[PDB]
Every structure is written in C-alpha cells, then in structure tokens.
Ligand binder design. Structure first.
Ligand SMILES: CN1CCN(c2ccc(Nc3nccc(-c4c(-c5cccnc5)nn5c4COCC5)n3)cc2)CC1
Length: 294
C-alpha cells in the first residue's frame, strides 16, 4: 500500500482529531492523519466516502489512500499536503485584504455547495459534512481553501431516496453546534436538517475570517466564535445556554459598516444564523452571493 511506501517525517499537529504528519510517499510530501484508537468509525466513514464516491474537487482535501500499519494498529488517511496548514492557524499568522478574504470564503462556499449537491453524472450523492470549522479547512498556495475531515458525513441519493447516516458515536465540535443540535430538536431522518447544520457552522467560519480582513486601517484580533461567552473546550450545556436559552449570535464589529465587502458579509452570516433552520440560506445561494460581492 501507499502506507508501506510512506515514511513519517515530522508531526505538524496533535489534538482531538489525532495527529497529522508530513510524510514522504516515495519522496513526495503527503499529509498523514493518524486517527485516535477511540475514533476507528471516523477513519472507516472517511475511507468509505473517499473510496466509494467521486469525491474530487479544488475545494475538498485530495485523497490519496487509507492504510492500517503497526507502530498497536494505527489507521492512516493519506492526502495532499498543504504546507500552509489550517484556516484556524492561517488566521492567526496574518490579516487579509479584500481579494484574499473573498477568495477564502468563496472557495469554502464552493466546496460546501459541491458536497451538498447530488450529481447524476461522473456523479455523487448529496453529502452533509456535520463538523465544519476553521480547524478542518486547509489553506492552499493559491489562497483558496479545501474542506477536510468527512468522518461525520451523511449521504442522500434521490434515486433510492435513502439517507445514509453511518454509525459513528462522534458528535460535532460543541462550539460550532447549531441550536437544533444542542437542544436535540434536529429532524434526524431528513437530509436537509444536516445541510442546515453545515450552514450554521459556515456562518461562524465567515465571521472568523471577516474579522481578519483589514478595512480603513482597522482589523480585529483572531477569536473563535463565542470567545466572549463560553470557556475553552466549552461543555454541551455551556453552548446550550448561549445559543438556545439566551439565543446569542456573534457580534458584528461596528467598523464593518464602513466597508462595502464586510457590510455584505455581515448580511450573509446573519442569514446563516437563523434560530429557525428552514430560514437559513443554502450553500448554493451563499456561493452565488459571494461570486457577486467585490
Ligand atoms: C504554524 N503552522 C503552520 C502550518 N502547520 C501545518 C502545516 C501543514 C499541514 N498540512 C496539512 N495538509 C493536509 C491536511 C492537513 C490536516 C488534516 C488532515 C490530514 C489528512 C487527512 N485528513 C485531514 N487534518 N488537520 C490538518 C491540519 O490542521 C489540523 C487538522 N494538514 C498542517 C499543519 C502547522 C503550524
């Protein structure tokens, strides 16, 4: 396998996802994610999606191989290596201009609309991600991004009209959970519920990015969504009180209203955050609006 022709060179991150290494695949740099022993289901689900679907797009992390190897058993997922790393890390490294901000959020919208749309082709089922955040989006050398971490993905096919929810005890990152997830009101048998959860998450990511775009000499420091009202590693109950009971949304800095681009992005992210999931914009409507914005 690719794993047997692959040498780990250096650990570029460790956390809740497991570990990510820069590896050498017959000399070529690749990313190797080593799953936690507790997270076999995420490895199995991502491997399943990458191997069984035509999941190949500029704005989705490029799959090379999955592998099992001794070191106990380790489960590896081998992909394209993006030397700039995650959007989370990148937003701490730098501020953005108008072109850079729009290129990042349009590229995320394009990946997410590509996951959400069924293609009959060639083709692919509709896919909801269910754990979108700035830490599982990669920054590419051209300034576009790509979406990673499909281990919670849910699939729908119009031909069979069947929802494939998989079998993974993992739940989303608590900070990014939509209100319907947190108060357990989500309609688990309707595919559209899952897409709407991605739109809430995407809204928070748009907020994270937009804070870092400079306008009229002013920029915000990088903060995660709800930095002001929940602690690090917030509990399910911490989040439930903020989003379901108090019905709070991230604050729009006043300085955005002196910039045409940030004014349009403030409009967009609030229509991602309707408490009523049915009222949120779709990934395709977001893509179209971002293509028009200057
Ligand atoms: C300050 N910095 C900058 C960049 N860093 C860095 C550099 C390169 C990469 N490369 C990379 N390429 C592809 C995927 C991933 C990856 C993946 C990944 C890899 C393989 C399969 N599926 C997901 N998960 N995560 C990441 C990175 O962020 C944490 C979560 N990383 C990373 C960081 C670390 C610290």
């Amino acid at each position: 396998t690719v794993a047997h022709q692959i040498t780990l060179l250096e650990c570029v991150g460790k956390g809740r996802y497991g570990e990510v290494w820069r590896g050498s695949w017959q000399g070529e740099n690749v990313a190797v994610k080593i799953f936690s022993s507790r997270d076999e289901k995420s490895w199995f689900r991502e491997t399943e999606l990458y191997n069984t679907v035509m999941l190949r797009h500029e704005n989705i992390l490029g799959f090379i191989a999955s592998d099992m190897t001794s070191r106990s058993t380790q489960l590896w997922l081998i992909t394209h290596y993006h030397e700039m790393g995650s959007l989370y890390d990148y937003l701490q490294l730098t501020t953005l201009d108008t072109v850079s901000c729009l290129r990042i959020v349009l590229s995320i919208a394009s990946g997410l609309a590509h996951l959400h749309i069924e293609i009959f082709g060639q083709g692919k089922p509709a896919i909801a991600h269910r754990d979108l955040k700035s830490k599982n989006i990669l920054v590419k050398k051209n300034g576009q991004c790509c979406i990673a971490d499909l281990g919670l993905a849910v699939m729908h096919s119009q031909s069979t009209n069947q929802l494939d929810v998989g079998n993974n005890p993992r739940v989303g990152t608590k900070r990014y959970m939509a209100p319907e997830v947190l108060d357990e009101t989500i309609q688990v048998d309707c595919f559209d519920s899952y897409k709407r959860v991605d739109i809430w998450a995407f809204g928070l990511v748009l907020w994270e990015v937009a804070r870092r775009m400079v306008s009229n000499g002013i920029v915000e420091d990088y903060k995660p969504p709800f930095y002001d009202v929940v602690p690090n590693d917030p509990s399910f109950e911490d989040m439930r009180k903020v989003v379901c009971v108090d019905q709070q949304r991230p604050n729009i800095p006043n300085r955005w209203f002196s910039d045409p681009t940030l004014t349009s992005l403030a409009k967009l992210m609030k229509e991602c955050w309707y408490q009523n999931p049915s009222a949120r914009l779709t990934a395709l409507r977001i893509k179209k609006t971002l293509t028009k914005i200057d």
